[PDB]
Amino acid sequence: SIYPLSPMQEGMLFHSLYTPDSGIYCSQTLITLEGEINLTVFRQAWEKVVERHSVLRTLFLWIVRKKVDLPWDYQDWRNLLLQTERQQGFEFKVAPLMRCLMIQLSDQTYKFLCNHHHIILDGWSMPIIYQEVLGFYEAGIQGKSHHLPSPRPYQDYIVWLQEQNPSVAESYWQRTLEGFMTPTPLRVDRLQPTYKEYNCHLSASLSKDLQSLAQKHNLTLSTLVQAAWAILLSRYSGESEVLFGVTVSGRPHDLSGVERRVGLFINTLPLRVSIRESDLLLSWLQELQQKQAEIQDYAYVSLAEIQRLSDIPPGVPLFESLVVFENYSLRVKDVENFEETNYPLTVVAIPRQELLIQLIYDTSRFTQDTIERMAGHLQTILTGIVTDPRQRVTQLPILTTQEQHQLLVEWNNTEADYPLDKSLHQLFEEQAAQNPQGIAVIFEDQKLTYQQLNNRGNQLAHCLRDKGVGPESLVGIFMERSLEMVIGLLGILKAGGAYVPLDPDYPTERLGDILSDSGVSLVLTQESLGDFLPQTGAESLCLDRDWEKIATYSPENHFNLTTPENLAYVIYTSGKPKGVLISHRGLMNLICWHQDAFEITPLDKITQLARIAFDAAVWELWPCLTAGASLVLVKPEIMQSPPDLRDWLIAQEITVSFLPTPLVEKILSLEWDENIALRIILTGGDKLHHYPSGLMPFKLINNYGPTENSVVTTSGLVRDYEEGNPPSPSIGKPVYNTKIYILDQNLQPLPIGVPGELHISSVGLARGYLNRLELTQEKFISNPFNSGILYKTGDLVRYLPEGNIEFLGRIDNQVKLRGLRIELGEIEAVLETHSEVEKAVVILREDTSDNQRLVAYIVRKSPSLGIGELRRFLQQQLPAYMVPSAFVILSDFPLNNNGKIDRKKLPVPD
Amino acid sequence: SIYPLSPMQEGMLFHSLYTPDSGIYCSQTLITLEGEINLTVFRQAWEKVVERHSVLRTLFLWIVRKKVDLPWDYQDWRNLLLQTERQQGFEFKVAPLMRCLMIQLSDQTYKFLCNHHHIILDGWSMPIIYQEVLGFYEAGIQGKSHHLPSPRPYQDYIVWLQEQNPSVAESYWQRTLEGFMTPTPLRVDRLQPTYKEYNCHLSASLSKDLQSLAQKHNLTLSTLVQAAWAILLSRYSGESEVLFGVTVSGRPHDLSGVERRVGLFINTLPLRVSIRESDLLLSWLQELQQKQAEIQDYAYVSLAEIQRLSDIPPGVPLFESLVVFENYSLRVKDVENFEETNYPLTVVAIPRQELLIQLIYDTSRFTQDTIERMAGHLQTILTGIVTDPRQRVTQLPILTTQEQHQLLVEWNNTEADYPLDKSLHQLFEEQAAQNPQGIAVIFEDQKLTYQQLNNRGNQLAHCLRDKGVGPESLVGIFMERSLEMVIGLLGILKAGGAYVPLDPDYPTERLGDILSDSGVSLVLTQESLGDFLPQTGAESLCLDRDWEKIATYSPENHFNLTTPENLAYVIYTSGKPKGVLISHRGLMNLICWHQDAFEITPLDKITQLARIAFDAAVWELWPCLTAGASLVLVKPEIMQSPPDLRDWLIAQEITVSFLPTPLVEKILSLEWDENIALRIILTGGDKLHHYPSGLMPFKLINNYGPTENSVVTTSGLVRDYEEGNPPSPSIGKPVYNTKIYILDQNLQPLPIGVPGELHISSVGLARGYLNRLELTQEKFISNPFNSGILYKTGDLVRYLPEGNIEFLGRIDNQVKLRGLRIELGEIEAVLETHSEVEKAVVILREDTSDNQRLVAYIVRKSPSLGIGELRRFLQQQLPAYMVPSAFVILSDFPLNNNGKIDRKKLPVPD
C-alpha cells in the first residue's frame, strides 16, 4: 500500500489543499429506505464493503497514497424537512486521513446519506457500493454468506497508468480533435442551477426492433442511442461534425467484459462524429461503433488534459451534452446530490426491458416544451432507423407527424381568394370610375384627382402604344418623385408594358448598364434630368416638356390586353445587381392582401417616400391607388429629420405610412401626441432592433420579403416587449397565398427553435432574373413538398413557438465550426440594454479571410460611454467568448440607397 | 479623372465618414521662416504645386475619386504663443470637396502651417511639396522659370494596384511572418504622449568607413543601419528573430531609381530578421540586403492588411520600433505636428556628409539614460562592423568601453582580505578560548557555554576519528534541531569530516537514496529517530543514548588537519536532487563577509530556524558561533504564527534573525514595537514581493544565492518603496570575493536594463556535484573574463542603474517568441497594489505542453474579492494581452521544504 497518486488524483488533491473550502469534489448520495432494518447488520454491511475495496480505506500523504486495513464509516445521529435546509447544506470538510473519507448517517424517517471525495471514487463506483452493501445485508439479516469475488486493488490501475506512454494518447487526442475549434451549439437553448428530468419511454416494439438490429449488424444499443443523438445534434446545430460526451468504464485490461471494481478512473470522453451527405446509416453506424471503441484505447489522460490538448479555447467546455448508457427493506429512491456540477444536457439511456431515455436538462438553458420536442425527435429518429437502415443519414426524419403537419401544412394555410383575372391598371380604373373626384395624388400644393390621373395616364398610354409598347415591353422611367412620375408609372402599365425604375441620382454609367441589361428602347423622363441620360440609342419622352405631344391623345381607357403572367415591373436587387421580373399576379396578391390586412379605404391618406428604384415604392403606390385613397408624396427634406417627419405626419393627418427601418427606429425614441390620424406605421427592409413603447398611438407592423417575391412575404404586428419575446421583433408570419419553409442545407425540415434557410412558395414569385437563366434555376427550384416552385432566400431564420419567424441574418455570413452558441443578435440586444447605447450591430469578421475577430459597432446617445466601460459591461452580462475583441464607436450607420445597413462600408477596426 | 480609391484610401474614407470627428487622419506641418517674403509669389508657388500634383486638387464621391484642375489653398489670417493653445488645437474638420483638402496659414512672426488628410498624401509626400514650393518661389522672386518634369498622375498607381493580384502578396506575407506570434519586446523600456530626440552623431571616419564597406560589398548605408538595429534588438530582446518597421517608397515600376511623385502609397513594411550562432556578418548582410529588397516586391497591401494576415493577435502592433533612412528666405525648422500617432521608438538615419542617427522615443516608455546608452550601443556596433566584418554577428560587441568596465570590472571589485589559511572549527575554538563562559547555544531552558560546546565537540571528534573519520569523510547527521545537533555538526567538523544533513521528516526511501548517494558509513542520530534510519550497512551513533561512549574521550582540541579545499558539508538542491560539495574556503569567505556586513559581535543573539537540510542553516550557525554570539534554536511552533514569532523575537531580545521569504512577507504586515533589540532581519530564498514600511524598527536585508556558491552571492538593504524602485525589492549586489555576470545565451555581456542569465565567479563556488562529473563540467565552466571558474545559475536577472540586481525568474520558464513585453513580476506588483490582494504570483503555463494560457494565483485578505472584479481591475490598469486568462484564488501558497514556492503543486485552472 505504497503507491503514487494518478495525475487526476494529484490535481484534485492540490486543488483541495490550497483553494479555500470548496466542496467542488464533494459527492453526496441520499437513499430513501422504507420497511424495517437490522441497523446493526446494515452498518456491518458497510464495514464489509469498506474492508474489501482498498480505496474505501485509503489515505493521502503530502504525492503518495496509503491503504491500511483498519478504518470504516461513522454514523453521527438518527431520530419539517430541515435536512436540505441545514443538515445537508453544511459540508465543507474532508481530511485525507486513514479514517475513510466517507461519512454516513441513517435517520428517523429512514434516509441514508453518503459523503465522499472524488479522489477515491467515481460516478461509476457508487452503484457497485450500494449493490454490494445491500447483498451483504440480505445474506446476513439471514445469517448466511454473500459470496463475491475479491476485487482488484486499484493500486494496479496505478501501475497500469505508469506502463502507458502519455505521448501516445496525447498525439491521438491532438490528431483527432484538430479541426474542432468551438463546442457544438444546441441553438434550441435559451439566451442566458436547477435540473429537471423528462422521461422518454420507448415502446416495447421499438426497444425490441433496436436490439434486433444491433444483433443483426454487430452494433450495441449504446451505439444506436449515441447515433440517434449525433443525428439530432447535427440538425439542431447545423454542423455536419458534432462533439458530445460519452461515458466509459476507464478501467481496462478487457476486464470491461467480466469484472467490476471501485476507485477513480476516467469516466467521460469526447466523441467526435461527422456526417456526410452520402453517408448511409448502416456503414455509418459500423464506423461509429469503431470510433467509440477506439477512443476507449486512449482512456488514460484526463478530460481536463484532453480539453487543453484540443483546439478548443481555454476556459470553455468542449461539449455541453453528455450521453450515458447505464448498461447495468426495499429501496425507494437514490437522489444524487452531487449537484455541484452537471452538464447542461445529459441523455441517459437505461436499458431495462423497455428502453428508457432520460433527458436531464438545466432549466435555465431549456424550456419544458423544447425538451419534450427533443424527446419526440429521438423517438422519430430511432423509429426511422429500425424502419429502414439503408437510408441516408442526412435524410432520416426528425419531426413528429404533428410537428411536420403544424410547420409545413397548418402554419402555411394562407390560401385566400383574390382577383386573379384582373390587372393592376384595371383595378385602378374601377377606382377612378367610382370616385372620379377623389384626391389621388398630392405633392406639396399640386394635386391630381382620380380623373386627372386616369385621363393623363390614358393619354400617355396611347402615345406609348404608338411608339411600340405592349405586353412584355420594358419602358425605362427616369424621373424625380412627382406627379409626373405617377402618371408615367400608370402610363406604362396601361400601354401593357412593365416599368424599369432608373434612379435619378445614379451615375451615368450605372444608368448605362441598366439600359443595356434591360434593353429598353424608350425612357420616360423630365426636362430636369434629360441631359443626365447616357446616349444609348434609346428614345426619351419628357412628360414635362413634351406633354403637348401626349395631350393630343385619347384619355379613354383602352382594352385590357395584359395577362397576369405579363411583366409589370423589373427591379434590381443588390457580381452586378440582378433584375427581377415581377408579373401582375404577384402584385394582385400583394394588393388584395395589403388592403385586407390594414383595412385600407378611400378615406386613407398614405405616404410615399421610398425611392422608385426600391420595391417598397410598389407597395406604397398600388394598394393605395387601387383602393381609392390619397397618396401623399413626401419631400425628402422632411424625411431627413425624425421629429420633423413626426410633426409632418401628424400635421398632414396621414393614416398609414411606410417608414424604412433605420428611420422608424429613430421616430420610436420621440414622444408622440396621443390623438393623431396615424393608425398604422409599416416598416421593413433591414432587421428592426427595437420594440415600440406602449405609449405609441399607432400600431407598428414589421414586414419582410425579397424582391423575388413581390415586396412582402411575412407581416406581423409588433407590440411592446413582454418577456418571452426574442431580442428583436419578429418578422411575423406568411401573407396570403404564401407558404414558407425553414430548411437545412440538404433541404430537410427543421423543428421550432432551430435556425435554417427560408424558402418561399408563393403566387408572388418572380418569373426569374432578367438575363440570368442559370441563376434562375439555381435559386428557383422544384418544391419538395408540393408541385409548386420554391425560392431559396439565402436568409437565416427560425420558427418561434407560436409560428412567428425570427430573422437571424444571411446564410453567407455563417461559418461552420465557429457558430458561437450565442446568436449575434443576442449580444446586440444586451449591448442595447445599457442606456447610452442607442443601437448596436455585431459582425463576425470585418477584417479579411485570415482571422474572424468579432467586432461590435455602437452608436452612442451621448459621448459619455467608451470602449472599455462597455467592454466590462458585456463581460459582466455575458461571459467571455461572448464578448467581441473590437468595439467601434460610430456616429451613424452606413446606409445603402434603400435604407439597409451597408456592411462592407463599416470601418474595419484598429 | 474617373478613378477608384485604393483599399487604403477607402478604409480611411469610411473611417472618417462614420466615426465621430477624429483627426486621426489629420496631418499638420508647421514651418518657421525668417527673412522677408514676397507673400504674393509664395502663394502662387503653392498654387503652382497644386496645379501639377493631381491629388492636391482631388475630391471624393461617396468609391470614386475626382481630379479637377481648379481649386487651391486658402490663407485664413496673418498678424504670448497662443498658437498651440487654440490656434493649432482646433482642427477637427476636412470635407472631401473639390476644394483641396489642404488648408494653410502664414503668420505675423513668420510661421507657415499646412493641414491635410492622409487620403491624399504620404509622410514621404510633404518634403517633395516644400522643395517644389521653395523652388517655384526662388525662380519667381526673380522672374525666372523653375523647370521640373511633369509628375505621374497617381491615377496610374491605382491602375497598377488593380493589375496586381492580392492573393500573391497575401500568401507571401502569410508564409514569411508565420512563426512570429508576438512583437519583439525591447525590455529596456518602462512599465507603463510626449516624444524626445536624442541625436547620435557618427564621426566623419566611421561614416566614411561604413560607406566604403557598402561599396566594397554591394550593400547600402540603409542596410548597415537596419543591420545595426537588428543586432541591437536581438540582444535587448533575447530573441534570435526580431521584427521592426522599415520605411519604403511604396511607389514602384523602378521609378524608385529616377523620379519622385506625390500621393498615398504604402510607406512602412515589417522586416523580419533572424540571427543564428554561425552567422557571419558579411554573408548575413548580403542576405539582409535581399530580404529588404524582396519585401518591396510585395508592397501593395496595407500594413493593417499585413497585421491581421500575420500570426500576431488582433489588437496588438506587430512592432514597436521603426527604422527610417531619409535617403534624400531661409527655412529654420519643420516641426511635424502629426503627433497624432508615432511608434514608441523610431530610429531615423539622415545621411548627410556625416551620418546622423536620431532616436525619437516615447518618454513614457524610455528614460533619457536608457536612450543615451542605446546611442552608445549602435555606435559600438557600427564601429565593430567596419573594424572587422568577417566577425560572427552574435559575438559583435555592443557595450561601450566605459560600460564594459563598469559592469564587468568596477561593479565586480569586491576583493576582500579574509583568513584563507584557517578553517571553521579553528575560528570556533578561538571563540571558545577567548570567552569560555559565554552562552553559545540556547534551546528553551537548555544552554551550552562555549566551553561546554567546545569540550563535548572535542569528545565526539575523538570518538569519531577512532571510527575512521578524517578529511573528505562524509558523516550523516540525522537529528532533531537541538543542542545535540550543534554538538554533532561541530564534532564532524573537528574530526576533519564534512556533514551530510538528513532531514528527520524524510521518508525512509529518500534517506536511503541520500545514504547511497553520499556513501556515508556513519550517521550521528538520536534515540528518538534511530529506528527511522533505513538499514543500509552504515554504523549509527546516538548522541543521546550513547553519550557515555563519547564522554570517555578527550575534550582537548586536536591538531588542525583539514585544508581549505577540504569538504565541509554536502547539501542537496531540488531528475533527482544533486548533492553540492562545499569546501571550507567558501565558508570562511561567507563568515568573514557576514560578520563584517551585519557587525556581528558576542553581544548578538541570533536565531536558528532553518531546517538543517537547507543551506540557510549554515549561515545561521557559523557566522554566529565563530563570532562569540549566542545562537537561539527556535521551536517550530513559534514559527507557525507570524504574530507569535514577532512577540517571541521581541521577548527573547534577538538582535539579528533570518526569516525565510514567505514568512518575512507576513511579519511585515504586522505592527511592531518601535524599541526592540532586533536590529537586522535577513531574508532570502524565494523572490520577496513586498517592501518594508518605514515603521519597521529593524532593517531588512535581502539576499540571494545558489547552494553551489556557499549560501549567499548577493545582499542588499531593502528600504521602503520610493518611486524609481522596481516592482519587487532588489537582491542587492555581490558579496566579498564574488563577481557576477549577466550574460546572453552565447555568453555575451549585456547592458543595464537587459535581462540575462546570472553567472558567478567566487571563492565560494562548490567543488562540484557529488557523483555528477558530467554536470559539474556543463555548469562550472572556464571564465571568459578571467582565469577563474564561472557557474551558470539558470537564474534570469538584470542590472538596475546603480548596480543592484533585479531577480526575474528561472531561465527554463522563458519561452522564445512569447516573451510578453511586460515582465510577469510587473503584473504581480500591479495585482498586489489593489488592497484585498495580499500576494499574487503570475505563471506562464500551469497547463501542459500544448498551450501556455498565463494564469494568476491570488491570495486574498478577505473573501470580498472575486475573479471577475479582479479581471476588470487589471484590464483597467494594464491593457489586455497583459491580463491572464485564468485567475485562481488560493488560500495559501504551496511551499517546498525550505520555504520556496512550489510551482508544480500550484492548482491547474478549470
Ligand SMILES: Nc1ncnc2c1ncn2[C@@H]1O[C@H](COP(=O)(O)O)[C@@H](O)[C@H]1O
Ligand atoms: N423586415 C425585415 N427584417 C429583416 N431583414 C429584412 C426584412 N425585410 C427584408 N429583409 C432583408 O432584405 C432582403 C431584401 O433585399 P432586396 O430584395 O434585394 O431589396 C431580404 O432577403 C432580407 O435579407
Ligand SMILES: Nc1ncnc2c1ncn2[C@@H]1O[C@H](COP(=O)(O)O)[C@@H](O)[C@H]1O
Ligand atoms: N533572494 C532571492 N530572491 C529570489 N530568488 C532567490 C533568492 N535567493 C535564492 N533564490 C532562488 O533560489 C535558488 C537557490 O535554490 P537552492 O540553492 O537549490 O536551495 C536560486 O538559484 C534562485 O533561483
Ligand SMILES: CC(C)C[C@H](N)C(=O)O
Ligand atoms: C418587406 C418590405 C419592407 C420590402 C423588403 N425590404 C424588400 O427588400 O422587398
Ligand SMILES: CC(C)C[C@H](N)C(=O)O
Ligand atoms: C540566500 C539565502 C537565503 C540562501 C538561498 N536561498 C539558497 O538557496 O542558498
